[PDB]
């Protein structure tokens, strides 16, 4: 439950992400296409964590090999970050339950929910730029930190490491479009309103995909997947459904040859007659 | 007469409160309000709609549809 | 009486604004406007629909439906 993410190069990045995925989850029988899969996080009970050290961003040397990220195992949520220099693990308010041995623990005022680091930083994911520079800067932003308050520039630093670790762990789409900023020239990844819409619908996608069976399309919320190789090229690991459920007990409906989240379908099959509006 | 069979390519709400639908290659409009959310449910789910009418040229009106 | 129980094969909005539905092997129509989105929903989602009338020959009217 200690892993690393190697920001040295394009191929060393996905090696890190993959090694963490294989370690954390098992592939789905019906969603494989060339060793790349959609896998579902394993039952682990219940406040289990992983500490993933960030190791790269220096390219030529070996600086910055401090700072590790704590991520709950079932969630892929970030509980907080350790500072391996000062040996202090800064845990978010809503993450009180999970404790790692030895390291000092400073419970903070504010929680991890993206609404919070967006408000108290400045930027919002969507429009947000993440490069190799912005990661070094975001690294130094967390080494200079102490207290239980959460500054503006430390809320920026978590919003960027969240996007490129736990977020890209989840979605192969973020992995691909970000790994660009690692090789020569700093191309600079921009988080598009499309990648952001994927992170909000994570749990919903998770509940649907297990029931897929070569069904051409998949339809969940505002998100569409035209074939098996658009799922595969977007989602990498999903929550375990056995948060997960919004209101239903029916996860899915097969309509024509498309798998709909039954809830998205219900939400446009509950309209009154329509001539009934004339009675206003 | 079956005028067009296929999936709704686009739909349009018009200013006169009629609803326009595009099937095969052609455009058809209905003045029946009841038909609007039914036609939208079909467009979203790729249902195969067959528009029935007495005149089958583009820009013709309809009040009869078959949903598959 | 139970006239036909099954999945809706196709459905049709008619020019007099009634709604025809095909269940088991036979066609049945209804004048009830509320039943229109209810039936199209039952079709899309593969609900088992049972039609209830006092005359059961194909082409009869109904205003009573069980939705399983």
């Amino acid at each position: 439950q200690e892993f690393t993410i190697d920001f040295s190069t394009q191929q060393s990045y996905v090696s890190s992400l993959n090694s963490i995925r294989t370690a954390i989850s098992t592939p789905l029988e019906h969603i494989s296409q060339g060793a790349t899969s959609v896998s579902v996080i394993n039952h682990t009970p219940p406040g289990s964590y992983i500490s993933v050290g960030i190791r790269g961003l220096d390219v030529y040397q070996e600086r910055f090999d401090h700072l590790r990220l704590i991520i709950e195992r079932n969630n892929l949520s970030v509980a907080g970050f350790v500072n391996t220099t000062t040996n202090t693990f800064y845990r978010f308010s809503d993450f009180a339950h999970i404790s790692l041995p030895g390291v000092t623990t400073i419970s903070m005022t504010t929680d991890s929910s993206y609404t919070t680091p967006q408000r108290v930083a400045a930027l919002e994911r969507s429009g947000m730029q993440v490069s190799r520079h912005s990661l070094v800067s975001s690294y130094l932003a967390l080494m200079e930190f102490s207290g239980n308050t959460m500054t503006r520039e430390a809320s920026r630093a978590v919003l960027r490491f969240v996007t490129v670790t736990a977020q890209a762990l989840r979605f192969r789409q973020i992995q691909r479009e970000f790994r660009q900023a690692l090789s020569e020239t700093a191309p600079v990844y921009t988080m598009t309103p499309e990648d952001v819409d994927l992170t909000l619908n994570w749990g919903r996608i998770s509940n649907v995909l297990p029931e897929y069976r070569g069904e051409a399309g998949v339809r969940v919320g505002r998100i569409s997947f035209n074939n098996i190789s658009a799922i595969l090229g977007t989602v990498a690991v999903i929550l375990n459904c056995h948060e997960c459920q919004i209101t239903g007990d029916r996860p899915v409906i097969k309509i024509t040859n498309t798998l709909w989240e039954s809830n998205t379908a219900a939400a446009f099959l509950n309209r009154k007659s329509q001539s009934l509006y004339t009675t206003g | 007469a079956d005028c067009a069979k296929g999936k709704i390519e686009f739909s349009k709400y018009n200013e006169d409160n009629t609803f326009t639908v595009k099937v095969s290659g052609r455009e058809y409009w209905t003045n029946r309000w009841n038909l609007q959310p039914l036609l939208q449910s079909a467009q979203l789910t790729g249902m195969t709609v067959t528009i029935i009418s007495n005149t089958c040229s583009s820009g013709s009106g309809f009040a009869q549809v078959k949903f598959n | 009486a139970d006239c036909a129980k099954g999945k809706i094969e196709f459905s049709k909005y008619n020019e007099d604004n009634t709604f025809t539905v095909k269940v088991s092997g036979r066609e049945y129509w209804t004048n009830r406007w509320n039943l229109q989105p209810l039936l199209q929903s039952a079709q899309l989602t593969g609900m088992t629909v049972t039609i209830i009338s006092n005359t059961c020959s194909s082409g009869s009217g109904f205003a009573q439906v069980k939705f399983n």
Partner: nanobody
Amino acid sequence: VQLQESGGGLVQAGGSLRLSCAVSGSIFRLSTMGWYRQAPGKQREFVASITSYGDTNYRDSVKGRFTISRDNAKNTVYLQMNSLKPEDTAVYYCNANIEAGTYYGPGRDYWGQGTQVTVS
């Protein structure tokens, strides 16, 4: 809401005329459009009508000779009167009638001003 008709005038028997009626766009697609005539002394009579979906109907004394049609782009209805008879002399009226299934404000039946047609 305006119905403005034109065409019509004097014409010898066996001759032909083509009426046309220009409807306000707000109700044109909502309407089945008709032509009604009224002779002097006699009461209004149905001639021809066409629905929004293109279904046509005719008084059988006018079948084979008259054909009604819509142009949905110009918001107009036409009646093409062939081989007119003396029977056919009257004042023709355009009619827009909102269909069971749509809704315009409280008005559900509109009429045009009228246009005289004479056959010697």
